[PDB]
Each structure stands twice: as structure tokens, then as C-alpha cells.
Design an enzyme around this catalytic site. Structure first.
Site, short mmCIF file in Angstrom:
data_model
loop_
_atom_site.label_atom_id
_atom_site.label_comp_id
_atom_site.label_asym_id
_atom_site.label_seq_id
_atom_site.Cartn_x
_atom_site.Cartn_y
_atom_site.Cartn_z
CB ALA A 1 -21.62 4.33 -31.76
CG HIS B 1 -2.24 -1.17 1.18
ND1 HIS B 1 -3.16 -1.09 2.17
CD2 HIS B 1 -2.88 -1.68 0.24
CE1 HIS B 1 -3.30 -1.74 1.39
NE2 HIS B 1 -3.52 -1.89 0.33
CB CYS C 1 -1.87 1.70 6.26
SG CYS C 1 -1.07 0.41 4.71
CD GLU D 1 -20.35 -2.51 -26.40
OE1 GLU D 1 -20.10 -3.94 -26.90
OE2 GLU D 1 -19.34 -1.95 -26.74
CB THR E 1 -35.68 -12.92 -22.11
OG1 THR E 1 -35.61 -12.17 -22.06
CG2 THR E 1 -37.09 -13.23 -21.15
CG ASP F 1 -23.41 -7.32 -34.66
OD1 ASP F 1 -23.68 -7.27 -35.03
OD2 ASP F 1 -22.12 -6.40 -34.26
CB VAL G 1 -29.99 -3.51 -22.68
CG1 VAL G 1 -29.07 -3.46 -21.53
CG2 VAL G 1 -30.39 -4.74 -23.41
CD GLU H 1 -1.54 4.25 3.89
OE1 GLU H 1 -0.93 3.69 2.61
OE2 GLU H 1 -2.67 4.31 4.01
NE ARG I 1 -15.70 -3.41 -26.21
CZ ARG I 1 -16.33 -3.66 -27.14
NH1 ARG I 1 -15.41 -4.94 -27.69
NH2 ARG I 1 -17.15 -3.61 -28.05
N1 AI9 Z 1 -21.89 -0.39 -35.17
C1 AI9 Z 1 -21.06 -0.03 -33.82
C2 AI9 Z 1 -19.81 0.31 -32.31
N2 AI9 Z 1 -21.33 -1.09 -32.29
C3 AI9 Z 1 -21.92 -1.20 -31.34
C4 AI9 Z 1 -21.88 -2.78 -31.17
O1 AI9 Z 1 -21.90 -3.29 -29.67
C5 AI9 Z 1 -20.95 -3.97 -31.34
O2 AI9 Z 1 -20.89 -5.63 -31.42
C6 AI9 Z 1 -19.22 -4.26 -30.79
O3 AI9 Z 1 -18.67 -2.80 -30.89
C7 AI9 Z 1 -18.27 -4.56 -31.32
O4 AI9 Z 1 -16.87 -5.12 -30.59
P1 AI9 Z 1 -16.77 -6.52 -30.77
O5 AI9 Z 1 -16.69 -7.04 -32.28
O6 AI9 Z 1 -17.20 -7.59 -30.28
O7 AI9 Z 1 -14.80 -6.48 -30.80
N3 AI9 Z 1 -19.95 0.77 -31.74
C8 AI9 Z 1 -19.68 2.26 -32.52
O8 AI9 Z 1 -18.91 2.84 -31.03
N4 AI9 Z 1 -19.53 2.10 -33.89
C9 AI9 Z 1 -20.40 1.73 -34.31
O9 AI9 Z 1 -20.32 2.32 -35.50
N1 AOF Z 2 -4.82 0.69 -1.39
C1 AOF Z 2 -4.59 0.90 -0.03
C2 AOF Z 2 -5.57 0.86 0.78
N2 AOF Z 2 -6.74 0.22 -0.41
C3 AOF Z 2 -7.66 -0.33 0.40
O1 AOF Z 2 -8.04 -1.99 0.98
C4 AOF Z 2 -8.62 -2.41 -0.20
C5 AOF Z 2 -7.60 -3.76 -0.80
O2 AOF Z 2 -7.05 -3.96 0.83
P1 AOF Z 2 -5.75 -5.23 0.37
O3 AOF Z 2 -6.33 -6.61 -0.09
O4 AOF Z 2 -4.72 -5.24 1.33
O5 AOF Z 2 -4.63 -4.83 -0.22
C6 AOF Z 2 -9.53 -1.80 -0.45
O6 AOF Z 2 -11.06 -2.63 -0.54
C7 AOF Z 2 -9.02 -0.67 0.37
O7 AOF Z 2 -10.20 -0.02 0.61
N3 AOF Z 2 -5.74 1.28 1.17
C8 AOF Z 2 -4.61 2.14 2.72
O8 AOF Z 2 -4.41 1.46 2.58
N4 AOF Z 2 -3.52 2.32 1.37
C9 AOF Z 2 -3.66 1.57 0.16
O9 AOF Z 2 -2.73 2.11 -0.88
ZN ZN Z 3 -3.35 -0.40 4.29
#
Ligand code: AI9
Ligand code: AOF
Ligand code: ZN
Ligand code: AI9
Ligand code: AI9
Ligand code: AI9
Ligand code: AOF
Ligand code: AOF
Ligand code: ZN
Ligand code: ZN
Ligand code: ZN
EC number: 3.5.4.26
Lengths: 361, 361, 361, 361
Positions: D155, D51, D85, D292, D223, D201, D297, D53, D185
Site C-alpha cells: 500500500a 469429493h 472416486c 506484505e 536475520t 508496528d 523483503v 464424484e 489473509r
Molecule cells: N499502512 C498501511 C498498511 N500497512 C501494512 C502493514 O503491513 C501493517 O503492519 C498491517 O496492515 C497491520 O495489520 P494488523 O494490525 O496486524 O491487523 N496497509 C494498507 O493496506 N494500508 C496502509 O495505509
Molecule cells: N477434492 C477432490 C479431489 N481432490 C484431490 O484429492 C486430494 C484430496 O484428497 P482427500 O484427502 O481424500 O480429500 C487433493 O490433493 C486433490 O488433488 N479429487 C477429485 O477426486 N474430486 C474432488 O472433489
Molecule cells: Zn476423489
């Protein structure tokens, strides 16, 4: 934004178009509006010619009747070189007028507004008076004080020297700075300098720029008329030369000089007093004076408080020297509590040099 | 843009976190990246303690293996107060090193790159070189030339006067300007003034700005020790005080001021030579000097051409008067063809005054 | 460059006539003699003096040997009065600076050659782009024979112009709607399909602080099913023109004509956009601000009849499978058949975002 | 403008250096300050590793005794992948502690500040809490709500269509904007879409940016579990694939896919409810989800109000088509008064496309 403001604004920008073409006359803009439509626009473009209103109203045509008119300066009421504009406004049947500010000129002071009011015309003033003010500083100062607008200029090394301890000054500031300095030999009706400058540099004191249409009056401060009789400012006939002396000036020599067209002004004192010089220049028609040379001359001006603008060009060089001539010679101020405060107006670089301009506060 | 440039930027920004904490040691930063991730970061935080690389490489751990490392200054290869950072790099398994710039000193320069090249490490140079240079401007100067980085500072009226003809100077530049100058009693290891200033004002020459880590060495220039032991540095030495004198500097005094903490130096000549003083301080480990003392002192530094920076504060005030002290006195240049040309590097309005700073070509 | 300074002045002078020239284009002119601005002019009133006429008349005697800057090719046809090109030739002007040539292919270059043939020097191109912007709409109308078309639409961030229930009263902010009001001032007609009138009963009037005139309100109403009590038919605030087909009821057309409504009957079953544009041009409408009508927009787009598109997006999301989108109608079948536009501007007004795009060539 | 918050800004900057190396862990930075000097610095650079600290206190060495420390997050007091820490701080001799913001884990929060205070450590807290909040936006959200931080990206054409009425979507936005889309991503633990988006797609929903490391969890909303038996997500084996279904899910098919690595979550409702899948996902560790999916959705997410951020990419194109699919379908809001107000966060052009990002208020 506003609407009455947009019109006065347009008038101010129309005014700018005459900058440097109107000589002793101020810059002025005029715009006529009839039925919410701009129908006339004008500016004072040439000294001795139509004033802004004349152009604007003549353009306005028949829409002049019942219309409004915005003028950056109050319409003149006198019969000088051009007929009264106030009269043109009333005879054209203008409904109401908007004046940015009153013309401080003695023979127009408020008189132009009265002449239009008594004819029923509604007169309104104040709209953008601030910028209207910034439009003719010199003309205004001269009309309000009776004294010429004075600008002091000097070039120096960054440590404040105007020459080495041996009087060398061949190249303190660059050609760009010198060229910039030439602008002033156009915005001012006269160049002022002490004879020490003529004896040393035998300058031409004339403007070497493009739009040559009226060389500036070259004034020379010569306490005991020791000026070299062969000097350019005396035998070049290029421009008017006025010299100021005292009774200590040699009568014969003084007669020889005027024989060349030089106008001598003999002051009834022993040491040329700057204030008397200014008053006399104002009375002869000089509205602005560009004091170029004589650290001693600048000293007299600074000590008597006879300057509106200070312009120094500093070169990126250090001269040094206990005995090197500094920027301001003469008496000087005894202690800090007595030295006047100024404010910097503009800081701008010109080539490798720095140009600092400040004004009384 | 470039990721390489981002890492070096980060290293540069880390280096600054130790400003005013590393004493004579330069500011240095380092970041270690492994498989596109940042795994180590370090900077030189304390003089005589771990270098940037030691910190970053430690933090990186096993990640240092096969990783790249960006450093602002060539990794040490000697044995000062820390084992060679190049060795540390070689043994950590680091594959490539990105070096901003090489080491200043001409004897240890490149010795680091060579070692690492010998061990098969790829060394890239130049990335953000210019910025690395600005980070340790004074240090880089000292090592490269063998002499202190000299900064001449002064404040005068618009007409270059340091005081009125009657010695008054109580109010020239704004307090805001006097305050802006304090930032130099922090970036320079020494402050230099002439005895003239000491008895005229009796200055403290101590940094008052919030940071109070150490006292800029107070160097005083004297010739016969006319310095009033009755005041200043002498009484309560808030910081080190060094006086440079001449053979004829009395005896009971020379060994009397050493009674406090005053380190008295004594030059052979009868005329205190600037080039000898800077060499003396260079020997004393002083890497930079901030000169503000008298017009004469500045005159000597200027004539000798011993300065890398000129900083003039100009107040919008005209003091005037012949015999009114100017910015630089003493010898000075007689021929304008002999006046060194400098260059303005920064114009800055501070309060009501203007701050001009020029550097030599 | 003084050339550009003078043309810019001519350009700024041309603007003063905005909205005051009807079908005539905006034009500026400035006469320069011996480096001085002696004449200025702009076309200010429809059917009245052209810029060249005001400028040259103001220049007076100074016109001889002078230079003139004109934003548009000086007219060259012989009507009631001599063309402006002839005026220039007579005045004695020796050099002409034209920003651009006449848009009419049959006149383009005519004034130029007319002036060269009289020994006058003619230079073209100076600030053509700006001179082009100045009359954009006018230029388009003259070059293509159809009105300049701007499509405007307000919608939620997801492309909806109303909820699924038709509720749309204020998707965008007061600031956004106020901004859109500007286009009612810059276009000669505002257009919508009857659907908009039925759903919103808008006045479609220009309510800006200054409005010397109202744009023609055009309604596309196939069957003439417009509500006889709608504002566009009763407020009498501005002209109202409707386009119907043969299905329209004769007695209703009579009732509406009595209210001052202008009805055009098309000989087609459906209202064709290319035909309405053609008929509007025949009536002198050089510009059309198209808003209301997702179907209307669709037609203008499928037919490719817009020069600019302005979409105001609000930081809102209105869902709805049945909520109306921005462009209804046929639409393009394949992504390779969809014309590519180009973003011309992106500005935020209040909490909304305004995007403007124009097709590409 | 105080040192107090300069140190915290520094810690914040240090913490920023571990961006995209933290993974689940939050970015944290720590600065140790002894007697006015930066003696130590640290940040969490790698998952499961030390961490902030730790690094900082180590680098601070013996200077940690009686020093201060600025942390961008409350020092952990629990035993996760690394010890407490807060324990470390205490045992180090550090007396004051500046925390920018308290920990989000309610049960695991507060303790740290308490654990320390119990040792006599003065614990000040709140400095730059604003900045510390944006540093770990997603992480804090998840811990405070137990729900994943959601982002809706889409998009479309400038008229809000995500395809033509033919379904053709062969690139609306430019590749530049498609690559800009990839960055997400990488910062979200999961990417989600509806089955419609799959059986039309067959995307891989995989990430394709340098240093891919872990590939986000692919979540599909089906679904009736009609997802194609052969789909890059079903059989790619690149990344995990979670599917949410209902009771109507064929048991046979359910088993098949489970043998392919697909983890299936069956919901006991007739329709899939976003709040339920967001609950499940959080339970499984998923802190963020990049949605996306489809318009249906997105409509569900918008309607429920289950999103923290919305990102729309608009292409300079008009698709049109009353039946072309829109951005957000589904039930949607009936009245404008019901419509939730969002706020534009960022507006940036990417190539010829525009990227709008907004957030609920
Ligand atoms: N059709 C377009 C998009 N289309 C978005 C769709 O969700 C499409 O399925 C994903 O981008 C596919 O990604 P991958 O093949 O799995 O690496 N997104 C965009 O930003 N521009 C567009 O024109
Ligand atoms: N990275 C970070 C902290 N992280 C805190 O600790 C959790 C991660 O714990 P650990 O599994 O031991 O790495 C995270 O859920 C966050 O709340 N704390 C602070 O000490 N200073 C640090 O730099
Ligand atoms: Zn810590
Ligand atoms: N020495 C310098 C100046 N000094 C120039 C002298 O004042 C000289 O008298 C005038 O320029 C003469 O004007 P003329 O012969 O009529 O064109 N002026 C400058 O701006 N910089 C300097 O370095
Ligand atoms: N007289 C002025 C200056 N005067 C500078 C003098 O050298 C003065 O003795 C020192 O600055 C005193 O330092 P201390 O605070 O007593 O340690 N410097 C300025 O920048 N402006 C002025 O008006
Ligand atoms: N629905 C929206 C708009 N809707 C535009 C409609 O065409 C509406 O009928 C007219 O703007 C009404 O104009 P008038 O003030 O009566 O003259 N326009 C907008 O700028 N924002 C919206 O949310
Ligand atoms: N130039 C100018 C004015 N100028 C006023 O007139 C004086 C010049 O008078 P004249 O001798 O007739 O040219 C000048 O002293 C000023 O006070 N008045 C306004 O009518 N509009 C103008 O444009
Ligand atoms: N501070 C510093 C370096 N300093 C280099 O070492 C000299 C200091 O040596 P030492 O006496 O051992 O501390 C200094 O003169 C410079 O040339 N090198 C790089 O390793 N990284 C660092 O952080
Ligand atoms: Zn007049
Ligand atoms: Zn080292
Ligand atoms: Zn014409």
C-alpha cells in the site's frame, strides 16, 4: 482519423444545421482551411439565400487566398436564384477544393468541377461520399430519376387490419405515433391521398407542428371527380390542392373547383396511372411525396414499384374479422416468386406502438 | 449484493438444470447453508423422482442441523410421488427456510409454510420472487387458473398476409425465422392446428431441434373429420395425435382412426368451442398449448380471449391484394372500443424478419 | 431541450478554433430566428473577429428579433471597434443565452447588464460546465494570474523513474509516450530542470501529425551549467528559455543568447517555483507541462503549484534502494500534512496504466 | 456452443460453490449425464468430506448405470481422507468420463485416468482445461512446483512511498481498501513480514473477517532474531508463528520463544534466502504465502523472482521526500534491459484508492 476527412466531416455536420430550412435546395456544408487553420465555415441555411460556400468564403476573409475549401456537394455553376459558387471560389483565389460528391442536378452535373479545373484550381472528389449521400436522399433521388421521392405510410393493428369490419378506426395507434407521423408532413413537399380518404375522413392534410413556414402540396387522386365540394381540402385555403382525374370528370364541377384555387390535372386515360401522376408532379416541382391514405392507393404504388420508403405503425391490438380492411388492397402479387424483397431500415417503438420502416432492395 | 439473494440465485440456477426433464412437474432448486458455508444443493431433475430438497438435504447430512435452506418453490406438504418436503425439512433440524414464492394450486398453497411454522422454523418469503415466477410461467398459470397456457404463433408479410391471393405462401419468412419458431415445439406440451392446415400443407408438427425427449401432443381441430387419413399424424404417429370433432363426425371414421392411436374427442355442440377444448386438455393434464393453425383458429382463440402470448414473425415483403389471406380471420371485433389492448413485450430481428411478441394486459 | 441543442452547437463551433487563437479564449455563437439556425460563428484567428461578429453578420436581416447563444459573456469594453454586447444590441436580437460570465472579476456581468439595459432578455448557465471545460487553462490563468500546471511522470509500478544506475530509456511503452505527446500540444510551454537535459538531452518538441506551433521549452538551471551542445540550444526547432541565478557566467549567457536562447536571471540563491510561474505569466504563458525533474516535481508539489498530475505506470519492477523515486526533495513530514488528491481518470494504454489526479478543495 | 462443454462449464460452476470451504483441497465439480439428461451434480464443499464424484453419483442413483460424467479434475485413485472416486466411477456402471485437466501430484497423477481406462471406460480429457486452471490457481502451482504460491501486496502513495521520511504511516490508503486487503489473509495459508515490520508496528497479522475459522500461519524473517520479546505475534496465541533465522541467532533467546509456541527455523547461510524459506514452508504444508513484509523483503522476493502475483494499493496522495521509504528496496535491477516485464491483470478502484494487480510473464 484523417485530416482531409475531419474537414469534410465538419462540413457534413455544418450541413445538418440547415435541415428543414432549405426547402427544395439540398443541405450543404463548406469549410475553408488556410495554413492548416480553419478560417471559414458555412452551411446552406435558408432557401433563396447564400449557399454554404458564400458564407464560408465571406467568413474566410482575406485568408481565402491560396486556401483550401471542402464542400459536401460540388459548387454550383449556374446563375439561378443565387450566383455561381464555382465562380466565387475561383474569384476568391482558392488554391484547391475538395468535393464529397457531384451534384446530380441536370444544370450542374459535373459542370461545377469543370469550371474550376479550367481555371487551374485543383479539384478532388470522393471524401466521405457515403455520408454526403445520406445527407440529401430525396433531393438526390429526384435529380437522378426525375421522379419524386415516395414514402408510403399506414397505421394498423398487429394482425394487419386498418379498421374493423364496420369501418371503425377511431383509435388504432396512440397519439404518440400520430404525432411522430406528423414529422413526414414536413420532410415531404406533398401529401398524397385518394378521394376515398377525403370522403371518409374529410382530413385537413395540413401540418399541425411548430415551424409552420410552407404547407405541403395536398394531392388528391380522384378518377371520376366525386370529391365533396364542401371538403376542407377545397374550402380551407390553408394549402395548395391538386387533384388528378380523367375525362370522366364533370366539366362544370371541374370549373367550380378551380374557381376555389384547386388545380386539376386531367389524365388522358381511364384509370389514373400512378407513374403518370409522379412524372407530372416532378415536372411541376414536387421533389417528394408522402402517400398517406388509401389501402387501394398504396396498392397501386406497391404494384407499380413507385416507392422508396415504406412506414408502418403497428398497435398492440388485434382486430380480426374476415371482412376487415387490410393494409394493402388492389391487385396484389399472384405468387411469392413475384413479390419484391425489401429490407427493414429501422425498428423503433413509439409509445405502445411499433414503427417498422423498410425500403426496396 | 445480499448473500441471501446469492443463495436464492444459486437455487434458481440449479432449478434450470432440469428443464425439459421434469415433464408436468415444475423446476425447483434448493441450497443448504450451515455456518456460512454451502453444504447442500439440489434440483428437481426427473419427473416422479426426488424433489430439490430431498437431494440437497441428503447431501448436507449432519450439516442440515441448525442450518438455513433456500428453495425456489414452497416445499410440498402433501403426498404425491414423494413424502412431504416440509416434513423432511422439519426432521432434518433445519432452523430457517427462505421461500421465493408460494405454491400455485389454491388448495395446497401455504400448507407447507404453516407446517414448518408449526414446528418452529422461521419462514422468509419474497426473495427473488419475480425470477421464481419466470422459471415456471406456464406451470404457475395452469395451477392458478386451471387452464393451459396458450401461445398463438403466426408468420406473415409486412402487410400482414399469410399467403398471396392465390394461396401461395412457399416463401414468406426466412429459414432462420422458421428455425427460431421450433423452440416453441419444445416448451409447450401440445401443438394445435386446424384441419385446413393439415390438408393444405400436411405438416409433421414435430420438434426437430436437437432435444428429442418426447413428442408435443399434436392436437387437430376438425368438424366432421374431413382430415385426410391418407397423411400426416395418421400415418406413422411419431407422437400422440388428438382430434376434436362434432357429433356429425361420421361413424366408420371415428372408430377407424382410433385403429392407429388417434384419440378422438367429440364435442356436443355443432360448433367446436375453444373454451371447451382448453378445458378438455386441462383435464388431460396438458398445461400449455402452441397454436399455429389457420387464421380462423387464431380468430376463435382471439375472439374467445383464450391466449397469454402472441408471437408474429414479419418478413420484409409486401404481398398485397384484397382476398389475400390475413393473419386472423373469422368474426373479429366490430367496435374499436371493444378491441382488447395488449402490450409488446419483445422486438427481435431474426434473420431478415422481425419477431414481435405481445401479451395481454 | 432546444436550448441545450443550440448551446452545444455553439460549443462545438468554438472548438474549431483550437490552437488558432493564441491568448484569446475559444468562443462559439449561434443565432436562431423563428425556430431556425440563421447564423453560426466561432473565434478562429487571434486578433480577429469574435464569434458574435461572424454569427450576427451571417444572420443578416434575420438577426432582428432573433435569439443568440454564446458560450462566453459577450465583451463589453470600448476598443478600436464596438464591443460584442453593443453589436448584439444593435442587430435587434431580443434574447441572449450565455453559458458563463467573463473570468475577470472586473468585467464579469458587465456585458450582461449592458444587454438587459437595452431591453434584451438574458439567460445564463446553460452548459456552464462544458463551457468551463472548453477554456479550462485559459480560465485558470485569468482567475489566478498564474499558468495552469500539469505535472507528468513515467515510472515503474513501484515508483521508480529509472534504475539505480540512471538507466531509464523506456520504462513506459511507445503507446504511452505517444499519448503523453498530446500534452505538448495542449500547453504553451514544456518545463524541465537541467538535470534532465544533462541525462537525456531531449528535444521536448511536439511531434504530433499536426503542429502549427511548438511550445516554449523552459529549463531550470541554477548555475547555467547546461551543455552548450544540447538539442534545446541547437535544434532551433522551438523557443528555449532558461532561468538561472547570479552564479551564472556572463560570457556563457552571451554565447547562449546568440543562439536565440532567452535567459531570465533570478535574484535569489535558489530557483523558486512561485517566481518562475509569476515570470512566465508576465510573458503570457498560461499553461505549463512539467515533466523531467524528480526534484522539480517535488518543488511544484511542496509549493502546491499544480492543477493536475499525470502518472504513467509500466508493468515493471525496478528495485534499488538507490534508484530514484517520483518526487524527491523535502516531502511531507506527517500523514496529516499530506494534501489529498482525487483520481480523475484511469486508463490503460498498451500495456501501461495512465492515472490522472487533481487536488481537492 | 456444444453440450459437451456446457456440462463441464456447469461442473465448474458447481465447484465454485465450495470456495473457501475447500481449505487445502481443490474445488472440484462433477455432472452426471444419463441419456441426454442431468441426473446428478456435485462439488467438494467441505474439507475431509466427500469429493464431487460422490455427491453426484449418489444423486444420480440408478441413472448412473451407463451414463457419462464430467469432472473438473482427474478422479483420485489414492486413499487420502476419502477413498478412490475412480473406483467409484467404475463400480457405478458409468461408461464415458470427461476430465478437464489431469492431477498435479506427479506420483499421484495419471493413475486416475489409467485406473479408469483399465476398466473399459472411455476417458476424454481437455474440456475447458483453461477455466479449470484458474479455479485452483494456487493449489496447482504448489503441486507442480513444490513451492508455495506467493503474492506480494503493498500500500503506497501515488508517488510510491510507503511512509513519510519520518516513518509515519498512519494510513495511506482508505479503510475500504484495508478491508479489501483482509480477503487475502483468508485465502492464503500464511502471511509473512520482516522483523523490521514487527519492531515498528507490532502487528498481529491476524485475520478479521466473518467466519474466521483457521488463522493463517504468521512467518517472520529475522536475520539475527532481534524480534521484540513481547509482540502480538510472540504472545498473542491467536495464530501459529514461525520465525526464520540464521546462525547468529542467540541460543538462549531461541529457546525462550520455543517455549512460547514459536517454531524456529535456523538457516545455515549468512543471509536469509527466499528460495530456502519457500522450500521449508512448502515442506511444512504451507501452499500459499501473503507477503506484505517490508520493502527490503519485497525487493528480495522480486530480485529472486519468487512471486506469482503482485498487488499494489495506491492512495490519491503524494508523500514526497527523497528519504521517504519506497515500495521495493534492496539491490534491484541495474539496467532496463535486465528488468522483467509483468502484465497488468486487474485494475479496480476501491473507494478513493486504486488497486493494481499484475503477474510475471
Ligand atoms: N499502512 C498501511 C498498511 N500497512 C501494512 C502493514 O503491513 C501493517 O503492519 C498491517 O496492515 C497491520 O495489520 P494488523 O494490525 O496486524 O491487523 N496497509 C494498507 O493496506 N494500508 C496502509 O495505509
Ligand atoms: N477434492 C477432490 C479431489 N481432490 C484431490 O484429492 C486430494 C484430496 O484428497 P482427500 O484427502 O481424500 O480429500 C487433493 O490433493 C486433490 O488433488 N479429487 C477429485 O477426486 N474430486 C474432488 O472433489
Ligand atoms: Zn476423489
Ligand atoms: N386511425 C389512425 C390514423 N388515421 C388517420 C387518418 O388517416 C386521418 O385521415 C388523418 O390523420 C387526418 O389528418 P388531419 O385531419 O389533416 O390531422 N392514423 C394513425 O397514425 N393512427 C390511427 O390509428
Ligand atoms: N409458411 C410459413 C410458415 N408456415 C407455417 C405452416 O403452418 C406450416 O404448415 C408448418 O410450419 C409446418 O410444420 P412442419 O415443419 O411440416 O412440422 N411458418 C413460418 O414461420 N414461416 C413461413 O414462411
Ligand atoms: N523515461 C521516460 C520518460 N522520460 C521523460 C524525459 O523527460 C524525456 O527526456 C523526454 O520524454 C524526452 O522527450 P523527447 O521525445 O526527446 O522530445 N517519459 C516517458 O513517457 N516514458 C519514460 O519511460
Ligand atoms: N445549396 C447549395 C447548392 N445547390 C445547388 O443549386 C441549386 C440551387 O441553386 P440556387 O437557385 O442558386 O439557390 C440546387 O438545385 C443544387 O443543385 N450548391 C452549392 O453551391 N452549395 C449549396 O449550398
Ligand atoms: N417439484 C417440486 C415441488 N413440487 C410441487 O409438488 C407437485 C409435485 O408433487 P409430486 O407429485 O410429489 O412430485 C407440483 O404440483 C408442485 O406444486 N415442490 C417442492 O417440493 N420441490 C420440488 O422440487
Ligand atoms: Zn452555390
Ligand atoms: Zn417436495
Ligand atoms: Zn466580443
Amino acid at each position: 482519423g484523417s485530416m482531409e476527412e475531419y474537414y469534410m466531416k465538419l462540413a457534413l455536420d455544418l450541413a445538418k444545421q440547415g435541415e428543414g430550412q432549405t426547402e427544395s435546395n439540398p443541405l450543404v456544408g463548406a469549410v475553408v482551411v488556410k495554413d492548416g487553420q480553419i478560417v471559414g465555415m458555412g452551411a446552406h441555411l435558408k432557401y433563396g439565400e447564400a449557399h454554404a460556400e458564400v458564407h464560408a468564403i465571406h467568413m474566410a476573409g482575406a485568408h481565402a487566398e491560396g486556401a483550401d475549401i471542402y464542400v459536401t456537394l460540388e459548387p454550383c455553376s449556374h446563375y439561378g436564384k443565387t450566383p455561381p459558387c464555382a465562380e466565387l471560389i475561383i474569384n476568391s483565389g482558392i488554391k484547391r477544393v475538395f468535393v464529397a460528391m457531384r451534384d446530380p442536378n441536370p444544370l450542374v452535373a459535373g459542370r461545377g468541377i469543370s469550371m474550376m479545373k479550367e481555371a487551374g484550381i485543383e479539384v478532388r472528389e470522393g471524401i466521405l461520399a457515403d455520408q454526403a449521400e445520406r445527407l440529401n436522399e430525396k433531393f438526390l433521388h429526384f435529380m437522378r430519376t426525375g421522379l419524386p421521392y415516395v414514402t408510403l405510410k399506414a397505421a394498423a393493428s398487429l394482425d394487419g387490419k386498418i379498421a374493423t369490419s364496420t369501418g371503425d378506426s377511431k383509435w388504432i395507434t396512440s397519439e404518440a405515433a400520430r404525432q411522430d407521423a406528423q414529422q413526414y408532413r414536413k420532410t415531404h413537399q406533398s401529401i398524397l391521398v385518394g378521394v376515398g380518404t377525403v370522403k371518409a375522413d374529410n382530413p385537413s392534410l395540413t401540418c399541425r407542428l411548430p415551424n409552420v413556414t410552407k404547407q405541403p402540396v395536398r394531392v388528391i387522386l380522384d378518377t371520376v371527380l366525386s370529391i365533396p365540394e364542401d371538403a376542407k381540402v377545397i374550402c380551407d385555403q390553408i394549402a395548395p390542392t391538386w387533384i388528378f382525374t380523367t375525362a370522366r370528370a364533370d366539366e362544370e364541377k371541374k370549373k367550380r373547383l378551380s374557381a376555389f384555387g384547386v388545380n386539376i390535372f386531367t389524365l388522358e386515360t381511364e384509370r389514373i396511372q400512378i407513374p403518370d401522376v409522379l412524372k407530372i408532379l416532378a415536372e411541376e416541382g414536387i421533389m417528394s411525396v408522402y402517400v398517406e391514405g388509401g389501402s387501394a392507393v398504396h396498392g397501386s404504388f406497391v404494384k407499380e414499384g413507385c416507392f422508396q420508403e415504406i412506414i408502418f405503425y403497428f398497435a398492440p391490438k388485434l382486430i380480426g374479422g374476415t371482412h376487415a380492411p387490410s393494409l394493402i388492397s388492389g391487385e396484389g402479387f399472384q405468387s411469392m416468386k413475384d413479390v419484391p424483397l425489401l429490407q427493414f431500415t429501422d425498428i423503433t417503438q413509439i409509445g405502445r406502438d411499433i414503427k417498422l420502416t423498410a425500403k426496396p432492395t
